[PDB]
Amino acid sequence: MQIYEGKLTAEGLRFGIVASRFNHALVDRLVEGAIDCIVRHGGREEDITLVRVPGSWEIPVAAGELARKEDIDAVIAIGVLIRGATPHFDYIASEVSKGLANLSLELRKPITFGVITADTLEQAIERAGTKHGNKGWEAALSAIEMANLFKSLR
Amino acid sequence: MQIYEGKLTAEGLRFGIVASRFNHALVDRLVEGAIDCIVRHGGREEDITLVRVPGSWEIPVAAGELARKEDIDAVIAIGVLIRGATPHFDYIASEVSKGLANLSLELRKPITFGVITADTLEQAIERAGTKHGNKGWEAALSAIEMANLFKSLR
Amino acid sequence: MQIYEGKLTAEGLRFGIVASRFNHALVDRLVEGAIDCIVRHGGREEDITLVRVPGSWEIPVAAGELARKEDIDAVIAIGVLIRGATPHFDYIASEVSKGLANLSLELRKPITFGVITADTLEQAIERAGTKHGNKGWEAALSAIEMANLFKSLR
Amino acid sequence: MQIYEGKLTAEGLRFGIVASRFNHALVDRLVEGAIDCIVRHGGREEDITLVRVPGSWEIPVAAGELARKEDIDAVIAIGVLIRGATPHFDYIASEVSKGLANLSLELRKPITFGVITADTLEQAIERAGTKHGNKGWEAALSAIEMANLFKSLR
Amino acid sequence: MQIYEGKLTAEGLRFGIVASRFNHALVDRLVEGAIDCIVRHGGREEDITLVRVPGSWEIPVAAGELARKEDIDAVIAIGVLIRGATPHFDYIASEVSKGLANLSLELRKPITFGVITADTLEQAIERAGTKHGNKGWEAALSAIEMANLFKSLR
Amino acid sequence: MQIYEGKLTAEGLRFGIVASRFNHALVDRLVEGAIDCIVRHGGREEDITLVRVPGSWEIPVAAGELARKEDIDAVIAIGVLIRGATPHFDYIASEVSKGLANLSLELRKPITFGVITADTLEQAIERAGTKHGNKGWEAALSAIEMANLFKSLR
Amino acid sequence: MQIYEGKLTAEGLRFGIVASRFNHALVDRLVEGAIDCIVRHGGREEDITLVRVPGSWEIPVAAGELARKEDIDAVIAIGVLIRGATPHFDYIASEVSKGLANLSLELRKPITFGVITADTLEQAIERAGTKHGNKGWEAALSAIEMANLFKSLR
Ligand SMILES: O=Nc1c(NC[C@H](O)[C@H](O)[C@H](O)CO)[nH]c(=O)[nH]c1=O
Ligand SMILES: O=Nc1c(NC[C@H](O)[C@H](O)[C@H](O)CO)[nH]c(=O)[nH]c1=O
Ligand SMILES: O=Nc1c(NC[C@H](O)[C@H](O)[C@H](O)CO)[nH]c(=O)[nH]c1=O
Ligand SMILES: O=Nc1c(NC[C@H](O)[C@H](O)[C@H](O)CO)[nH]c(=O)[nH]c1=O
Ligand SMILES: O=Nc1c(NC[C@H](O)[C@H](O)[C@H](O)CO)[nH]c(=O)[nH]c1=O
Ligand SMILES: O=Nc1c(NC[C@H](O)[C@H](O)[C@H](O)CO)[nH]c(=O)[nH]c1=O
Ligand SMILES: O=Nc1c(NC[C@H](O)[C@H](O)[C@H](O)CO)[nH]c(=O)[nH]c1=O
């Protein structure tokens, strides 16, 4: 059987992170986790490109520009959506996730999903560096693995 | 009437399996089922290519690379999604299923769906080699049928 | 370790199917599934012998005649029992299952069990080609596996 | 595909009927139905052998003697069990059905089941020539079919 | 039509009775009824062989020895089972009835069933010489009929 | 007093294991336990013969072939039955246990019972390597003891 | 990978058992199990040293003396604590378990835990040779494994 997989050492890997500013008190924890994951897995901080955008709605268009760079191996999408009173949350969550997934396939490059889509503020806190981990750290780890995988797969 | 169908003998067929690591204790049973189905239907294990990715989110982009290979007749997607407290599950389940379906049409190649999308852990267990079967085995059997069908249809 | 197993290709295998007429609108779907399973697994339809009997009660005695044939590799028992108002169902279900199992051991030949024993009509429909599969297809697949296994085991 | 089945014309067929006397007011209707079914399907009444026994318990041992006769093509078992206050009914119903089924397999000869096993008197009446038919007639029709089937199968 | 039946005169008939000692205050009434039935139907008491055993569990093995005697025309099994707190009753009732039925078929000799299987003590009393008759008397009458029947049938 | 018993050291003992594939995610743990029990009790893995069958229904006929081998000292039956919506479970559980027990007596060779018969999935998990142990390990230990016992007893 | 494990044959192994007298009617069953486990796994009974003490409280200080013996390979602690009306149970259960564990580490020698700590008498009975096994047998089996493991590990 042929088996392809990615290791978790990030030596030489270059990452794009797109992080939204809405709910920054939480997003900022996700960005810390992502960078920490990259660096302590051996990636250089100098090899990270961070792009900030207003909200989750704007993440895809910026990710699309990063993912098109030949010297970016994977993109990590980071944001925090918390449900308000209207279905505003639903349309933005739907389109951010669809855009990111579509770009990854179109550009044949890993784009990982560190966007929280929480019904409540408490759930968002849980996932931004507390009891349910740090989704930035998780999405970065996935990007490490995928970039390594893609060295042989792509 | 012209009738086209695929038999279930897998002699000479070559398969790509993309399997996620999230919920591996269940995904690993799905992979065992898929391989077993292929091998005991006459497919050679050497003609199987297994690609591992972090989570169901990452299955599509890897499947896209496999399905593009001229020496892969069909791709089998294997993963396990279990609903958490937030709609995180919904956005990932939606995008994994849409990506896989879109890729299949774009590449004109069968990509089968052995991704469990369960509301509960119990339901996932049921479908990963217990009372409700093994979705890996099922998706592999579908891929056998489709690859054979495609020998005359494509 | 010595390991014996049966593959699922049916080339050269010869099957007996005994199917009851009671509840034929469901039994007939089970017979379709059994024949389809055999044929698309590489067995020839000519190599199938189908014996029809009135009810599940009469399946064992017919199966006994088929299983004694040297050119029958396995027998597939197909019928549909649905509970009525009295324990009639219990005595027939008990005896059909015991007879088939006893014959298999006495004749040292696989006899598989595609007899539905349902409490309700809905449950029978579920198992005769709808949401819970086709018990004829399942019993045929088992018979394929057992006949192959028996080529080395018997 | 080889197909074996029994037609429903009874010309030249010879039947054994074993009928118990317990609950005779209902068993007697079952015997009328069985004979009528045979005769109007073309069987001669002279070719019917009727054996009377006390209760359903005694049906098997008498059926064993009839089924051993070379000039009997099939045996029809007729009796009526209605649940009393104790499990007496369960042990008799279990043993009558098991004995009959066992004899059929041991002697390789059809023995059909026109024994009512009712929880209530009403249910027994329903099945002895009223709204739910006549189980004697039914069991006779099955024996006609099986004897014909056995002309080629046995 | 050929018709076989047994009359109820017991002249010249020889019977075996196997009676258990558990619940003897009731079993003893069953033995009185059995002997009375035989004698007043014309059988000689000298032609009766009574075998006593500890409990219903031991009835079959003793009945097996009696029924094998060429000078015994039928065996009458007599015992009293009353449900206790555990399923002990179920396993013994099941096996006594199965053994007796099996022996009758194996030895091609009538063995009648005068074993009470009662849920309550009251039910046992009812059936041991009170309002619901005497099961010993009943089983003896059946044995008379069967022995006579067997003079022509066996 | 003469006392016969089996020790638990398995040096030189040869075992047959028959394992069903239905509910393999659990059966596979039972097989691990059985093999582990044999090997760490001093049995050689080379002296184990493993036979795979589709379902619990098919275990008896395969076990019958293994148990007939003069170089097999005991057979371990391993399977997992979990109750569905219908009495299907009952008829299979009944016949698997009956067949195995009957074969053991007919062949005068130990056949041990490592078949789980659970009302719920949770109960099956409990007994397949979690809180209520591993029934494969247990049945193997029993087979070790019985094979040793049989060295003097048989 | 280097892998260390203990087999379950006890040839040549020498055990210390410390058993308390409080609740002896249960403890005595635990001691029976422990000795039986050892002996039937190949250990000699002569190689067992049994030390009796008044209550679970006193088990540690005795185990400390046994575990210091160079010719003792492992110590098995056996006792039965059942909750009374006061927290007396808690303080003794806490100190017995702590002492044993501490001794094991200090002396670098396996000391296994066959002390029942039951809320009820029923629970104690269950674990002292009835439905939930025999904790003496379990703790002995552990000690056999650990002593063997320690032959390479220590
Ligand atoms: O509204 N709540 C959220 C949000 N709204 C802003 C939106 O993404 C966009 O910036 C504006 O619609 C303008 O285009 N953006 C988030 O990241 N999280 C939220 O929870
Ligand atoms: O969250 N639950 C699940 C999960 N999340 C991980 C996700 O697929 C992706 O790896 C990350 O978002 C990073 O891109 N992936 C699954 O396969 N199943 C789940 O049940
Ligand atoms: O009654 N219901 C059922 C039925 N009774 C007919 C029976 O098997 C037999 O043919 C007669 O007793 C005559 O011997 N047979 C079935 O297969 N399914 C049923 O649900
Ligand atoms: O009891 N109820 C029934 C009955 N008991 C008699 C029994 O079959 C046997 O004749 C005696 O036990 C003596 O051997 N026999 C029936 O056919 N139907 C019944 O409903
Ligand atoms: O237990 N209750 C009953 C009983 N138990 C004894 C049993 O038959 C046997 O003798 C012993 O198990 C020893 O083999 N025997 C009966 O006839 N009736 C009962 O109601
Ligand atoms: O249905 N549930 C179960 C199952 N049915 C399959 C059956 O044993 C047999 O393979 C078929 O009837 C074909 O003969 N087999 C099991 O081992 N466990 C189950 O829980
Ligand atoms: O009290 N109940 C228990 C008990 N008390 C005695 C105690 O261990 C000690 O011997 C005295 O305190 C004197 O030192 N010892 C037990 O083993 N089990 C009990 O359930």
Curated annotation (Swiss-Prot), chains A, B, C, D, E, F, G:
Pathway, per record: Cofactor biosynthesis; riboflavin biosynthesis; riboflavin from 2-hydroxy-3-oxobutyl phosphate and 5-amino-6-(D-ribitylamino)uracil: step 1/2
GO CC list: cytoplasm; cytosol; riboflavin synthase complex
Keyword Magnesium applies: no
Residue numbers annotated as active site: H88
Top EC class of this enzyme: transferase
Annotated residues for binding of 5-amino-6-(D-ribitylamino)uracil: F22, N23, S56, W57, E58, V80, L81, I82, F113, K135
Reaction(s) catalysed by this chain's protein: (2S)-2-hydroxy-3-oxobutyl phosphate + 5-amino-6-(D-ribitylamino)uracil = 6,7-dimethyl-8-(1-D-ribityl)lumazine + phosphate + 2 H2O + H(+)
Residues annotated as binding (2S)-2-hydroxy-3-oxobutyl phosphate: A85, T86, R127
Temperature dependence: Extremely thermostable. Has a melting temperature of 119.9 degrees Celsius.
Listed GO MF terms: 6,7-dimethyl-8-ribityllumazine synthase activity
InterPro entries recorded: LS (IPR034964), LS/RS (IPR002180), LS/RS_sf (IPR036467)
Pfam families xrefs: DMRL_synthase
UniProt cross-references to CDD domains, sorted A to Z: Lumazine_synthase-I (cd09209)
Domain of life: Bacteria
Any single biological process term in GO: riboflavin biosynthetic process
Keywords: Riboflavin biosynthesis, Transferase
EC annotation from Swiss-Prot or TrEMBL: 2.5.1.78
Function per UniProt: Catalyzes the formation of 6,7-dimethyl-8-ribityllumazine by condensation of 5-amino-6-(D-ribitylamino)uracil with 3,4-dihydroxy-2-butanone 4-phosphate. This is the penultimate step in the biosynthesis of riboflavin.
Subunit structure: Forms an icosahedral capsid composed of 60 subunits, arranged as a dodecamer of pentamers.
Entry similarity comment: Belongs to the DMRL synthase family.
Protein name: 6,7-dimethyl-8-ribityllumazine synthase
Organism: Aquifex aeolicus (strain VF5)
UniProt gene name: ribH
